[PDB]
Design a protein around this ligand. Structure first.
Ligand SMILES: *[C@@H]1O[C@H](CO)[C@@H](O[C@@H]2O[C@H](CO)[C@@H](O)[C@H](O)[C@H]2NC(C)=O)[C@H](O)[C@H]1NC(C)=O
Ligand SMILES: *[C@@H]1O[C@H](CO)[C@@H](O)[C@H](O)[C@H]1NC(C)=O
Ligand SMILES: *[C@@H]1O[C@H](CO)[C@@H](O)[C@H](O)[C@H]1NC(C)=O
Ligand SMILES: *[C@@H]1O[C@H](CO)[C@@H](O)[C@H](O)[C@H]1NC(C)=O
Lengths: 49, 209
C-alpha cells in the first residue's frame, strides 16, 4: 500500500488497471485513495563455474 | 407526444475508476436516440415501470415535485412515493392515498434530506430501487452527460408501475431502458466523457470491437 494521491469520484470505491486488475482502493477509515502494488519477486539464476 | 433521447441517460454502471482507459460493458440502459414519451402539463397519468424508467424534466420553478412508484397505485400496495418538499427530498412507501387531484400543496420507510434541468433513471433490482440522477441548471439537451447514482434505495420493495406528481397552492420526458452493449470513455479523473451504443450503427460496432 502506497502514499497515493489518486483522485476518485465520491461513489467510486475501487479502481482497476488496463487488464482490470485492482490497483487502487478507497480505505473505509480514510477516504483518500491508496494505490496497491503487490510485492516484489523474480526468477532465481545460479551463476557458477 | 414523443421526441428523441439525444445521447442522454448514460450512467455509471460500476464504481471502477479508470484513467484514460476505454472500457466496454453490458447493462440495462437507455438506447441512443431512442423514442421517449412526452407529456406537457395542461397531465400526469399512470405509466408502467417496465424494466427501467428514464425521466427528464426541465422546469425553472420545479412544478414536478413528486413521484409515486407502486404496482397497482390504489393504496393496495406499498407505493414508493418520492416527494421533494422545500429543499427536503422525502422518500416514503406509504399505503395512504394522495389527494384527488395529484398535486402537492403503512409507511415502512422514511428518508428526509426552463432554467433548471433534472434527469432521472429508475430501475429496480432485487428490491433495491436504483436511481441515477442529476440536478443542474441550464426539448432535450444535445450535449453528453454522465448520470450519477445520487440515491440507492435499500427498501427491498416490489414495484411495477409509476406516476409523476405536480404542485399547486411542466414538460417532462419518459423513456424505457433496454439491454444494450456500451463502450465507455473514462477520462483521467474517472468521469465518463463519451459513450458508444454498439446496437446503434455499424460505426458504433466498429468502435466497440
Ligand atoms: C417536508 O416533508 C417532511 C416529511 O414529513 C417533513 O420532515 C420530517 O417529517 C417527519 C414526519 O413525522 C418528522 O418525523 C421529521 O422530524 C421531519 N423532519 C426531518 C428533518 O426529518 C417536513 O416537516 C416537511 N416540510 C414542510 C415545510 O412541510
Ligand atoms: C417517436 O414516435 C412518434 C410517433 O410514433 C414519431 O412521431 C416520432 O418521430 C418518433 N421519434 C423518433 C426519434 O423516432
Ligand atoms: C410485483 O407485484 C406485481 C403486482 O402484484 C406482480 O405482478 C409481480 O409479479 C411482482 N413482482 C415480484 C418480483 O414480486
Ligand atoms: C483532473 O484533476 C486534476 C487535479 O489536479 C486537475 O488538475 C485536472 O484539470 C482534472 N481534469 C483532467 C481532464 O485531468
Amino acid at each position: 500500500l502506497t502514499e497515493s494521491n489518486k483522485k476518485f469520484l465520491p461513489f467510486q470505491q475501487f479502481g482497476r488497471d488496463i487488464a482490470d486488475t485492482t490497483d487502487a482502493v478507497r480505505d473505509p477509515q480514510t477516504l483518500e485513495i491508496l494505490d496497491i502494488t503487490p510485492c516484489s519477486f523474480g526468477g532465481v539464476s545460479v551463476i557458477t563455474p | 407526444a414523443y421526441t428523441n433521447s439525444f445521447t442522454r441517460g448514460v450512467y455509471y454502471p460500476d464504481k471502477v475508476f479508470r484513467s484514460s482507459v476505454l472500457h466496454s460493458t453490458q447493462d440495462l440502459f437507455l438506447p441512443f436516440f431512442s423514442n421517449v414519451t412526452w407529456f406537457h402539463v395542461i397531465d400526469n397519468p399512470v405509466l408502467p415501470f417496465n424494466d427501467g424508467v428514464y425521466f427528464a424534466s426541465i422546469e425553472k420553478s420545479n412544478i414536478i415535485r413528486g413521484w409515486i412508484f407502486g404496482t397497482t397505485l390504489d393504496s393496495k400496495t406499498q407505493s414508493l412515493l418520492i416527494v421533494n418538499n422545500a429543499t427536503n427530498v422525502v422518500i416514503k412507501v406509504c399505503e395512504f392515498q394522495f389527494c384527488n387531484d395529484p398535486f402537492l400543496d403503512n409507511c415502512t420507510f422514511e428518508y428526509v434530506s426552463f432554467k433548471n434541468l433534472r434527469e432521472f433513471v429508475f430501475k429496480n433490482i432485487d428490491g433495491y430501487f436504483k436511481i441515477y440522477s442529476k440536478h443542474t441548471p441550464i426539448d432535450l439537451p444535445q450535449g453528453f452527460s454522465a448520470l450519477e447514482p445520487l440515491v440507492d434505495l435499500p427498501i427491498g420493495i416490489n414495484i411495477t408501475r409509476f406516476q409523476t406528481l405536480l404542485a399547486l397552492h411542466a414538460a417532462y420526458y419518459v423513456g424505457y431502458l433496454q439491454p444494450r452493449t456500451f463502450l465507455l470513455k473514462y477520462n483521467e479523473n474517472g468521469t465518463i466523457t463519451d459513450a458508444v451504443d454498439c446496437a446503434l450503427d455499424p460505426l458504433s460496432e466498429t468502435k466497440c470491437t
